[PDB]
Design an enzyme around this catalytic site. Structure first.
Site, mmCIF file in Angstrom:
data_model
loop_
_atom_site.group_PDB
_atom_site.id
_atom_site.type_symbol
_atom_site.label_atom_id
_atom_site.label_comp_id
_atom_site.label_asym_id
_atom_site.label_seq_id
_atom_site.Cartn_x
_atom_site.Cartn_y
_atom_site.Cartn_z
ATOM 1 N N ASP A 106 -16.554 15.479 18.190
ATOM 2 C CA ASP A 106 -16.160 16.764 17.775
ATOM 3 C C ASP A 106 -17.373 17.423 17.846
ATOM 4 O OD1 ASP A 106 -16.940 15.025 15.454
ATOM 5 O OD2 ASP A 106 -16.318 16.863 14.293
ATOM 6 N N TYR A 123 -13.673 16.048 1.988
ATOM 7 C CA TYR A 123 -14.416 15.713 2.826
ATOM 8 C C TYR A 123 -15.454 14.587 2.375
ATOM 9 C CZ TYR A 123 -17.190 15.720 6.940
ATOM 10 O OH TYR A 123 -17.897 15.735 8.332
ATOM 11 N N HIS A 146 -22.930 10.844 8.790
ATOM 12 C CA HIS A 146 -22.438 9.463 8.598
ATOM 13 C C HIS A 146 -22.533 8.463 9.583
ATOM 14 C CE1 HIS A 146 -19.029 10.374 11.257
ATOM 15 N NE2 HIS A 146 -19.569 11.798 10.894
ATOM 16 N N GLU A 202 -20.838 12.186 17.820
ATOM 17 C CA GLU A 202 -19.545 12.204 17.659
ATOM 18 C C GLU A 202 -18.891 13.291 18.354
ATOM 19 O OE1 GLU A 202 -18.440 11.648 13.767
ATOM 20 O OE2 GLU A 202 -15.936 11.940 13.941
ATOM 21 N N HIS A 248 -25.723 14.858 16.175
ATOM 22 C CA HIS A 248 -24.778 13.868 16.128
ATOM 23 C C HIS A 248 -23.831 13.727 17.338
ATOM 24 C CE1 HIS A 248 -21.468 11.852 13.740
ATOM 25 N NE2 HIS A 248 -20.706 13.132 13.403
ATOM 26 N N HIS A 290 -9.172 13.826 13.364
ATOM 27 C CA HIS A 290 -9.972 12.742 13.935
ATOM 28 C C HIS A 290 -9.290 11.353 13.613
ATOM 29 C CE1 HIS A 290 -13.369 15.795 13.824
ATOM 30 N NE2 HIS A 290 -12.562 16.157 14.678
ATOM 31 N N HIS A 331 -18.637 21.807 10.245
ATOM 32 C CA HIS A 331 -17.224 22.274 9.708
ATOM 33 C C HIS A 331 -16.910 23.124 8.663
ATOM 34 C CE1 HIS A 331 -16.492 19.085 12.604
ATOM 35 N NE2 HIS A 331 -16.784 18.038 11.799
ATOM 36 N N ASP A 349 -22.396 17.298 9.987
ATOM 37 C CA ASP A 349 -21.371 16.984 9.075
ATOM 38 C C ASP A 349 -21.702 17.333 7.709
ATOM 39 O OD1 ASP A 349 -19.250 16.793 11.186
ATOM 40 O OD2 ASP A 349 -19.840 14.663 11.491
HETATM 41 C C1 FMN Z 1 -14.941 7.929 10.264
HETATM 42 C C2 FMN Z 1 -15.697 6.921 11.309
HETATM 43 C C3 FMN Z 1 -16.111 5.487 10.683
HETATM 44 C C4 FMN Z 1 -16.845 4.779 11.593
HETATM 45 N N1 FMN Z 1 -17.253 3.529 11.035
HETATM 46 C C5 FMN Z 1 -17.643 2.656 11.859
HETATM 47 C C6 FMN Z 1 -18.223 1.300 11.583
HETATM 48 O O1 FMN Z 1 -17.992 1.135 10.235
HETATM 49 N N2 FMN Z 1 -18.902 0.585 12.200
HETATM 50 C C7 FMN Z 1 -19.070 0.813 13.613
HETATM 51 O O2 FMN Z 1 -19.328 0.013 14.221
HETATM 52 N N3 FMN Z 1 -18.824 2.176 14.067
HETATM 53 C C8 FMN Z 1 -17.710 2.896 13.209
HETATM 54 N N4 FMN Z 1 -17.424 4.120 13.875
HETATM 55 C C9 FMN Z 1 -17.875 4.784 15.331
HETATM 56 C C10 FMN Z 1 -16.600 4.278 16.167
HETATM 57 O O3 FMN Z 1 -16.162 2.801 15.914
HETATM 58 C C11 FMN Z 1 -16.785 4.567 17.512
HETATM 59 O O4 FMN Z 1 -16.870 5.883 17.617
HETATM 60 C C12 FMN Z 1 -15.578 4.175 18.551
HETATM 61 O O5 FMN Z 1 -15.931 4.345 20.048
HETATM 62 C C13 FMN Z 1 -14.477 5.071 17.902
HETATM 63 O O6 FMN Z 1 -13.257 4.533 19.048
HETATM 64 P P1 FMN Z 1 -11.944 5.322 19.296
HETATM 65 O O7 FMN Z 1 -12.280 6.230 20.257
HETATM 66 O O8 FMN Z 1 -10.956 4.330 19.757
HETATM 67 O O9 FMN Z 1 -11.668 5.834 18.160
HETATM 68 C C14 FMN Z 1 -16.996 4.956 12.880
HETATM 69 C C15 FMN Z 1 -16.495 6.382 13.507
HETATM 70 C C16 FMN Z 1 -15.582 7.185 12.807
HETATM 71 C C17 FMN Z 1 -15.521 8.657 12.992
#
Ligand code: FMN
Ligand code: FMN
Lengths: 401, 401
Positions: free
Chosen positions: B82, B192, B145, B80, B78, B23, B225, B164
């Protein structure tokens, strides 16, 4: 193994075809070389040295022209170990009478080698040296790219031995600039400049002017890395380009670099790339996971605009974007318009943070960063289109003066 | 493709053997899986979804048990991608009567999918839902998370479906925790945890408090996962560990990470590694050019001291060191002793900068950073051993309450 430049001047050293990781900071996709210069005279002189691991090829090369015991003078122009790595070996094999280095060079020699009893002698700017029939002239080029940096000038033969200056990372059978296609040579020159000499652009310019101030108009420019510049036209080529590189004038080129986990910031980047193309800009879209930071830097060197994307990751930006930013800031690119963008889920610091970076680099930020919550929509695209137009108009503006 | 967990409960989804870039932010050296759970009741329910590209394997698995159009309920725990990426395809194939998600989940569901007419229904912390013979209970686990995170409890079956949480990146023929060696299972759990849940250590502890506060004592833990935790002992292991992971208690482990161009910072690092051993520490010496940032993090998760080295590169630190510190700072490691060191040529900012980084992360800096001009000497070596002794002394103290 040695290569005749002119009567009494030979290129010796080593071709490093395999170099990719160039001294831990940048890339050399075409390998590199380690160039040293043997000058036959009353006082036989060796200019520069090579990487420690190539002491053998260097002495082999030397020996093909002269028994290493007959060299009297060692001239060390730069104390970086790719240039000075073999110095201890050569001292042993040559037992030189005098090791010549700049004043700053002798300090660095001390902190690198901590030497006990070497016949070191410091020369000063514009000082001259009799080698017998020929006489060398020394000019200092501090911070090009190290404080110890100095170049060597042969007024009669019109031979300049420039250490890293004018260097290019090219490993090849061809050792002269005219045996190599210009487009290759030039890209290699720019890549080299952008990733190491750039933060000393001003000194680049002042250095060139006073050498010109003096009567330095070479037919031969002999760098530590890459091919020899052979011919007054070629050497003129070299110096023009350095001037152009240090000047860092803008062009109609936009470089967008980003990283992303779930592709939203990638989608924004792709849209930006298209809108800019519509405004008549040339676009390079570079993914941090597919492009080394030195490759982004090479593209940024002649770009007018630098646009950076990152999603928000743990209250900041992605590691690879941060690393690349740290790299770029260090090299101090001038005269650029900045732009920033990203996707976030909740806290949303990334565009704030990106804007701080660019601003902190002296980049002009006419358009405010586009931030989007997760997956962008047509509206968000409209916003990006708008950011792109603002940046491009300002760019367009800049290029008209 | 479906795997029977218990009667009426099946594991469906996809094994992603080739996943290495997990990811965009971390590595999954052992691959990973995308776990969804099909529960056969009067109201037949699907928990979770998979990465969009695996919708087919998911539907196939599902269909192995039942016609997808018989599924009534979709619980999205969730948002996200995935976990939720195949949600659109599933709405299509299943025509579900209801989509269950957390309140923050429904929020994220709109900024990701921008859906128009979906039967989304928000569930509340502690709410229950009759599925027919079984009844499931929903708990909220914000910032574990993401804000939308929630888990699902089958109190009678003692089945915790945790998104997760408790997940591990393990791609294998074996789908249950008891079929893989603990050391393998444990290392992957920590890897993880360390790279995605670590900044939410406190929530980690709270949530575990409340689930236990309620009567959550699983016989099965079913994460998004990796393998399923089968058996109360296994489930107790998982929860034990998460508490341990979140507590971040020091150990006698020292992680040294550095980058270098001409190896002087490397030599300092090698010396450090030896002194720390001498002080009876376990040492991880990690080169940023050879170790992913996620890897260093995993080692740091249970280290008591983190030592960082970088030479000064353009008035700062090397890019890869910066990127790794950025990564690490975001994951908010706790209860660590910091250290810094490096070689410089003139400006010498690196140790200054490294220190600001460590201190900013709340690290304890009992010893002053060791900096060396260029190539270190025995004396410099003496300084480092001293540095190693100070930090180790401080470590020891900590380890006795
Ligand atoms: C590991 C992880 C860390 C994240 N931490 C933050 C965070 O600190 N603050 C935030 O606003 N969102 C955070 N996000 C959400 C991402 O910013 C959001 O999913 C964004 O659309 C991801 O953009 P991308 O598609 O360009 O990867 C996080 C997501 C992931 C998977
Ligand atoms: C690309 C380059 C840039 C440099 N930047 C600086 C500088 O900004 N400040 C400084 O004091 N040293 C600078 N140095 C000198 C290095 O810090 C010095 O060579 C040091 O010994 C390198 O340590 P290392 O062997 O661990 O790479 C630079 C040298 C290189 C090759």
């Amino acid at each position: 193994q040695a290569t005749k430049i002119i009567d009494g001047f030979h290129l010796v050293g080593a071709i490093d075809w395999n170099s990719r990781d160039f001294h831990g900071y940048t890339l050399s996709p075409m390998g590199t070389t380690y160039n040293a210069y043997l000058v036959e005279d009353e006082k036989t002189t060796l200019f520069d040295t090579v990487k420690a691991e190539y002491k053998g090829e260097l002495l082999c090369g030397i020996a093909s022209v002269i028994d290493p015991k007959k060299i009297d003078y060692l001239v060390i122009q730069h104390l970086e170990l790719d240039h000075a790595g073999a110095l201890p070996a050569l001292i042993e094999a040559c037992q030189p009478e005098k090791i010549f280095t700049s004043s700053l060079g002798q300090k660095a020699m001390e902190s690198h080698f901590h030497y006990k009893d070497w016949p070191v002698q410091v020369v000063k700017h514009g000082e001259t040296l009799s080698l017998g029939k020929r006489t060398v002239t020394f000019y200092e080029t501090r911070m090009l790219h190290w404080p110890d940096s100095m170049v060597s000038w042969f007024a009669d033969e019109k031979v300049l031995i420039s250490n890293d200056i004018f260097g290019q990372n090219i490993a090849a059978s061809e050792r002269f600039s005219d045996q190599i296609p210009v487009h290759t040579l030039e890209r290699a020159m720019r890549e080299y400049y952008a990733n190491i000499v750039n933060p000393y652009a001003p000194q680049t310019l002042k250095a060139i002017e006073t050498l010109v101030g003096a009567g330095v108009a070479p037919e031969f420019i002999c760098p530590d890395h890459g091919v020899i510049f052979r011919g007054a036209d070629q050497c003129t080529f070299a110096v023009q380009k350095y001037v152009e590189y240090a000047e860092q004038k803008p062009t109609n080129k936009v470089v967008i670099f980003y990283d992303s986990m779930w592709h939203s910031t990638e989608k924004m980047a792709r849209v930006l790339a298209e809108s800019f193309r519509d405004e008549g800009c040339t676009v390079k879209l570079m993914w941090c996971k597919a492009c080394h930071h030195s490759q982004i830097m090479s593209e940024i060197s002649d770009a007018g605009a630098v646009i950076v994307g990152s999603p928000t990751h743990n209250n900041g930006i992605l590691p690879y974007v941060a690393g690349t930013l740290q790299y770029i800031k260090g090299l101090r690119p001038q005269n650029k318009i900045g732009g920033a963008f990203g996707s976030f889920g909740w806290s949303g610091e990334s565009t704030k943070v990106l804007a701080e970076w660019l601003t902190g680099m002296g980049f002009d930020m006419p358009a405010t960063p586009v931030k989007v919550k997760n997956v962008p929509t047509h509206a968000d695209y409209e916003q990006l289109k708008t950011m792109a137009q603002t940046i491009a108009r300002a760019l367009k503006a800049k290029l008209a003066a």
